[PDB]
Amino acid sequence: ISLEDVLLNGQLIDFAIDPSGVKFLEANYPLDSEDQIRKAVFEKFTESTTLFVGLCHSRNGNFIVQKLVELATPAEQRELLRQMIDGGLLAMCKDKFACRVVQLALQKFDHSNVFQLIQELSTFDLAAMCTDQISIHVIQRVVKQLPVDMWTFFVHFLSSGDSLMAVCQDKYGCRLVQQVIDRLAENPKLPCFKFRIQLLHSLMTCIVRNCYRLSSNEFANYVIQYVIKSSGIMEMYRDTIIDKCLLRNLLSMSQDKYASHVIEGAFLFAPPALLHEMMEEIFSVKDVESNRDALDILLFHQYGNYVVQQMISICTAALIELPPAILLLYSGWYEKMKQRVLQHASRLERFSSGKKIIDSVMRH
RNA sequence: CUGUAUC
Numbered sequence: 001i002s003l004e005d006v007l008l009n010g011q012l013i014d015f016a017i018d019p020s021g022v023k024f025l026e027a028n029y030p031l032d033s034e035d036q037i038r039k040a041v042f043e044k045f046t047e048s049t050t051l052f053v054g055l056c057h058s059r060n061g062n063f064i065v066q067k068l069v070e071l072a073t074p075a076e077q078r079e080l081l082r083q084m085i086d087g088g089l090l091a092m093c094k095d096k097f098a099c100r101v102v103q104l105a106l107q108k109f110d111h112s113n114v115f116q117l118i119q120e121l122s123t124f125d126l127a128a129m130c131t132d133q134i135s136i137h138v139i140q141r142v143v144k145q146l147p148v149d150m151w152t153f154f155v156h157f158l159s160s161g162d163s164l165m166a167v168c169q170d171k172y173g174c175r176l177v178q179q180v181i182d183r184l185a186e187n188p189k190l191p192c193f194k195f196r197i198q199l200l201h202s203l204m205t206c207i208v209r210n211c212y213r214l215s216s217n218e219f220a221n222y223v224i225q226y227v228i229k230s231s232g233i234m235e236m237y238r239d240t241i242i243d244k245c246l247l248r249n250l251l252s253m254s255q256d257k258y259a260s261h262v263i264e265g266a267f268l269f270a271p272p273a274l275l276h277e278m279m280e281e282i283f284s285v286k287d288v289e290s291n292r293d294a295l296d297i298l299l300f301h302q303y304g305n306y307v308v309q310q311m312i313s314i315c316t317a318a319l320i321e322l323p324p325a326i327l328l329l330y331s332g333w334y335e336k337m338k339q340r341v342l343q344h345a346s347r348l349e350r351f352s353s354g355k356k357i358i359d360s361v362m363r364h
Numbered sequence: 365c366u367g368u369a370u371c
Contacts (some may be wrong), residue, residue, distance in 0.1 A: 124367070170370095171369070198366060261367085306367065351366070
């Protein structure tokens with residue numbers, strides 16, 4: 001049956017609710033921005049703030065609002081824009097389904113419109129927005145595919161105070177921080193690079209100056225690991241983080257549930273001179289009561305044993321196109337570790353960690 | 365005596 005028929009029978013909102021109805025609507029929504037039926041349908045949907053909002057919140061309704069968006073002419077976008085704002089833009093972001101419309105907007109609108117949109121977000125409580133599991137997707141979208149001058153206001157938000165701490169320590173705001181970084185440090189082969197790098201640095205500063213608390217945190221540790229696994233100018237920060245926070249801190253961090261994951265990756269990605277000083281450090285100061293060196297402590301630790309298996313992994317992998325000078329250095333470490341493990345085998349075998357550490361040393 | 369997400 002006809003779209004025109006549906007419109008003329010007052011059945012337009014009824015269709016947009018039904019899971020079948022909506023599919024109908026989408027299929028034969030005219031692509032000609034100039035079609036008379038399309039003008040009628042667009043206006044019927046967008047005439048009422050209440051009805052339009054409700055469509056965004058709809059499990060099914062949102063799909064047609066989306067269709068309206070991807071095909072929206074400039075003039076259409078301004079109507080959609082007004083209605084979003086007049087119907088609580090924030091509450092749209094907090095909604096599972098109204099969210100997708102906000103997001104699609106961001107992609108498909110025009111600079112002018114997107115602008116007032118982002119102008120609008122800026123005025124929200126960016127903090128609360130970044131924690132919300134749903135709301136965050138909107139900022140994710142802004143960052144992950146709009147030019148960084150659009151959302152510099154957001155970088156200034158993170159750099160300001162300790163908004164950053166709050167965000168990267170939060171269950172959901174963590175992935176955002178990773179993505180923002182990914183975004184600022186990307187495409188060395190761009191003229192805009194110079195500006196993004198200054199924004200990364202002010203951000204990266206907060207991160208470095210809290211590395212220890214961050215690395216030990218249930219979520220934030222994933223950001224640290226991000227920085228350490230990175231390729232570009234991120235390597236410069238990898239080195240500073242390792243050099244300032246991780247070194248001299250290896251022993252205690254290796255025993256933290258979360259920071260031991262960081263330590264592991266630091267060992268995997270540290271350049272040879274930083275790796276050499278990590279090893280050097282790990283291999284001895286004996287603890288006051290029952291004098292134990294770092295190595296003994298780690299081997300028997302529940303989280304610590306994982307860092308050691310890492311060191312053992314690293315060494316042997318390297319012992320299978322490198323100079324005989326550093327190759328003899330790795331050899332030095334495997335041996336120190338090999339003897340120690342064999343010395344404690346009778347004690348180690350009592351543990352799952354023990355057995356794996358033992359097996360790994362006998363195989364090689 | 366085996367040790368953490370977000371999407």
